[PDB]
Structures are given as structure tokens and as C-alpha cells.
Design goal:
Three copies of one chain form a homotrimer.
Chain A lengths: L2 E3 L16 E10 L2 E10 L14 E8 L17 E4 L2 E2 L32 E7 L7 E8 L9 E8 L14 E6 L4
Bound molecules: N-acetyl-alpha-neuraminic acid (SIA) (3 copies).
One N-acetyl-alpha-neuraminic acid (SIA) sits at the interface of chains A and C.
Chain lengths: 185, 185, 185
């Protein structure tokens, strides 16, 4: 069908600090040339569930994909928790081609180490809000195809950075809508 | 078809302070698993048409829906002004099922009074701009399924909050794009 | 098909200061009642490729369309670089009707000179980031049908304004997602 997602439940599927300490809620809906994306992140256990003054205010969630658009196991997100939608769940077969969901490699080329400075269009930068409190911004940076980790063909990364002291709080952010150009259609 | 909307005209349809003092422009377009939403709000009469120093800088527009996805009459938005699109208008039959437009209850569960602190992913927080002037932010908070008013099955609320003194101005904001996960597909 | 775009390559197609000094990357995907848009801008040559302290911190990119939704040659964007998608390129026939991609004239009416103050819903205002650096905001203002230049039927303009001193840098911004109501469906 035309949605890849994590499912909308709260079962931990992602690494912020340690394995499966967090729930990434990510939905990618194919709209022709573009994917319409929706993302949020919640810490369920570990450091980011009850932050301290020294907790690093920078968290990168990496989704690395192979040439078939299939998630690599070195990704932050667990493979078992990511697939095509069926009802409120995911399909049973694990290895379904997803090239039409991948970010376009002409729009968003892989880095070349010389320039060490790619096109800014490879990123989206905005704010989401910790605890859904309007005075608690967290910068979200979405980057397309900027990883080289583990021979990936494509990548989507979500980086959350902040400056304010959110010690004693649970990391949880508002939802963010975005789009990107796809490899196929 | 695949759009629910208010129509794009300027005929008042909504309550900010009193009945039908304002035009909510809202379009919900079904894109599979997600709705693509577009919203703006204009005060046509009453307090928010010519604000004062004491006008409350917090306005909640509530859309409450029943189990069929049909707007409840206790909503801020008038029933008569909300339906499936036809041309630049709305269809003639008033009571059309709209469950596929409703926010997903697994992604966006109704509150349980104990925790008194739901998932932050149930909200979207950003800024729109009063008068389309870049120095006049208004915080927009969109919340999914967080109301319990009048036995609603689903809800979408738009809250506009601000801190700057917009006395002597008409409330009118720029358009805001968003998406959310739907109950069905 | 259902995408109008510039293509995702880096071949200059647009005027910031002089002809074809910049690459506008713009994709418009038809989703029923709405277009899902994605935009970014890069200066390849001229003033905006290496800004100075006096470079004007205001750049308007104008797309003017005729009654058939076809770009007028007085637009900032070159005609030769804009058309319906095929693969990663554009179709061969140059003059394809695109009314279903045009911004809705009821939602976004042309100005009437008296009020000299249209509906704020005709604009979207947010920030994108120069160099994809989180401390370098650039205000993006998208306006629908607000031009009268050259007898246009429709218009979409992208204005980039800023206040910080970005001297010695290349103008290049992060991607921005938006939507608008269309004339037809
Ligand atoms: C939605 C939004 O823009 N929130 C912003 C808030 C609000 O403007 C003020 O709390 C009240 O207006 O101000 C900040 O300085 C803050 O609190 O950290 C930045 C933050 O991004
Ligand atoms: C689009 C945007 O971000 N606008 C912001 C403006 C501009 O940054 C400055 O007016 C000029 O740069 O600054 C604010 O402090 C303001 O005016 O209230 C917050 C507001 O949200
Ligand atoms: C994504 C975002 O909101 N960036 C904002 C940054 C960051 O908040 C701080 O650099 C660190 O938090 O602050 C600004 O004052 C700035 O740098 O110009 C406004 C800018 O829009």
C-alpha cells in the first residue's frame, strides 16, 4: 500500500541512549513525487526519561536504508517495528521493496568529502516542543541521504538539539509534519 | 470525495468570543493514512475584530465529533458551514460519515485523568503571524482527541495564544499546514 | 500527471539579483483540493553567492501564471526549467494546462487597492535556515495570488527576509513544506 510506519502504539522501538529506550512514532505516506511525513519521539526508559543537567542536549535518530529501501539493522529504529501499514499494525512479510519512499538522490545527494558542505535543501530545520509546552523548544533537524554509515543507499535522520535546561523532565515532543522528494513514482 | 472543509469564502462560521463572530478556514484532505490540513482564522465582529489591552490572548476553537466523524453542535464551528467539498461549496446532504478523517485513537488517545499528562505527540505547536506581519507571532497549538466535552468520540482543537500587545488590531492569521494520522484508510 | 516541478538538479533557473544566478528547487504535488509544496533556494553566482554587509536582506521570487496555469516569462523562474514531471526530468511539450495546481481565487483573492490590506490567510510565514545552520534564520513568506504584475491570473511568491549579518556566506536555505487550496479538483 502507500504508508510505511512504526505503528501508532507506545511499544519501545528506538535508541536515544540505549536499545529500545524510546518510541519513535514515524509515518511516511506516499503522495506521488513526495512523501508526507509525520514524526515524534518519546523516551520511555534511561537517561532521556528523566534528564539531568549533564544529559547531552543532542540526539540523532538514524534510519539507514539499503538499495531496496529496506531498513539496515545498524539503524537507531528496530527493524521488527517498521513496515508497510495494515489496520493499526504492520504487514507480516518483513522484506518489502520501498524505493518509492526513499529520498531522491538528485535532490539529496550523498556527501562528497572535499566540499565538506552539501546543499542546504538536504535538511529541514524547525522547532518542536518538549512536553507540548510552548516555552520548551527543541530544534528538529531532518536530513536526507547525508549518512555514509554501513554502506547505506539512502538515509533519513532526525536530530533533536536544545539549549534550555530540561533536567527532571521526560523527553517527549510534539508532532512534526514534513515532506521530501522521492526516488521513484 | 476526499476533502472536508469550511469552504474558502469569508461568511462567518465560528465563535472566538460570540456566535459567528469569526471565519475559520479549515480544509482536511485525505491522503491515505494521513490527513493534510490547512487552517486560518479571522475575526469579523466582536472583541477580536478590534482587540484591547485586556482582550484574552488565548482563543480555543473546538471541533468535537461523534463516533461517525460528524461535528457536534456544541463545537465552536457551525455545523451548517462544514461538509464534504463540491466545486467551491459543500454537498447538500448534512450527515455524511467521516471516520476516515478522524484522528487515530491509538496515536492520539483520549486523556485518562490520573496521569493528567498525555503523550506530547497529541499536539502540534508552531507560530502563525497576525496580520501576516513577521514581527507578530501567535502560537498555534493543534490538539487531537484531547477533549471530553459532550461525549465526543474525536476532537481537533486549534488554540491561538500570544504575549505581545495587539490592541487596536483585527485578529487575522497566516495559514498553517499540518498532518495527522487517521482512524481509517 | 500530478507533479509540477523545477526538477531536483542544480542547473540555475531563477533570478535573485541577475538572470539565472540561482537554483529554485520547487515541487508542487496535487493532493485533491490541496497542493503539497516543497521549496528551497540556492545562489550559484552574483551578489547572493557571496553576500556583503550591504546586500539587501529581502529577496522576492515571483511565479506569475496565466489563466491556463502556465508560467509567464516575466516570472523570476525560467519557463524552460518548469513543467510536469517525467522520471527526474520534465515533459517535452511546453504549454500544458495547470489550473488544478493554481491557488484558489476564493481562498486567496487578488488585492482590491482600497482596503490595501487583504486576508492574512493569503500568506504563510515561517523560518528556514541559511547554510542549514540552526542559528541563521531566514524568514520565508509565501503569498498566493497577491501579484498584479503583467495581467497574471494567479501568482505564488516566495520572499526571503532576514536581519542577521550573513556577509561572506552563500545564500542557501533548508527546505520548506507547505500546502494551499487549489482552483480545481
Ligand atoms: C511556539 C514558540 O515560538 N515558542 C517560543 C517561546 C514563546 O514565544 C514564549 O514562551 C511566549 O511567547 O519563546 C521562547 O523563547 C521560549 O520559550 O523558549 C522560544 C520558543 O520557541
Ligand atoms: C518569522 C519569525 O520568526 N518572526 C519572529 C520575529 C523576527 O525574527 C524579527 O521580527 C525580525 O527578524 O522576531 C520575534 O521576536 C517577533 O518579532 O516577535 C518573534 C517572531 O516569531
Ligand atoms: C531553529 C531555531 O529556532 N533557531 C533559532 C536560534 C536557536 O534557538 C538558538 O541558536 C539556539 O537555541 O535562535 C535564534 O535567535 C538565532 O539563532 O538566530 C533564532 C533562530 O530561529
Amino acid at each position: 500500500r502507500r504508508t510505511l510506519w512504526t505503528t501508532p502504539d507506545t511499544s519501545p522501538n528506538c535508541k536515544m541512549s540505549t536499545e529500545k529506550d524510546s518510541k519513535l512514532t514515524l509515518t511516511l505516506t506516499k503522495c506521488g513525487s513526495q512523501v508526507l511525513g509525520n514524526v515524534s519521539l518519546l523516551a520511555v526508559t534511561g537517561e532521556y526519561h528523566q534528564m539531568t543537567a549533564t544529559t547531552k542536549k543532542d540526539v540523532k535518530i538514524s534510519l539507514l536504508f539499503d538499495e531496496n529501501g529496506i531498513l539496515l539493522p545498524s539503524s537507531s529504529l528496530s527493524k521488527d517495528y517498521w513496515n508497510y501499514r495494515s489496520d493499526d499494525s504492520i504487514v507480516s512479510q518483513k522484506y518489502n521493496n520501498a524505493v518509492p519512499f526513499m529520498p531522491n538522490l538528485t535532490a539529496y545527494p550523498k556527501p562528497s568529502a572535499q566540499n565538506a558542505k552539501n546543499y542546504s535543501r538536504t535538511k529541514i530545520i524547525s522547532n518542536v516542543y518538549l512536553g507540548a509546552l510552548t516555552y520548551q523548544p527543541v530544534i528538529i533537524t531532518i536530513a536526507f541521504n547525508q549518512e555514509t554509515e554501513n554502506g547505506c543507499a539512502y538515509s533519513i535522520t532526525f536530530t533533536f538539539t536544545w539549549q534550555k535546561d530540561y533536567s527532571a523532565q521526560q523527553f517527549d515532543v510534539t508532532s512534526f509534519t514534513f515532506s521530501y522528494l522521492t526516488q521513484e513514482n
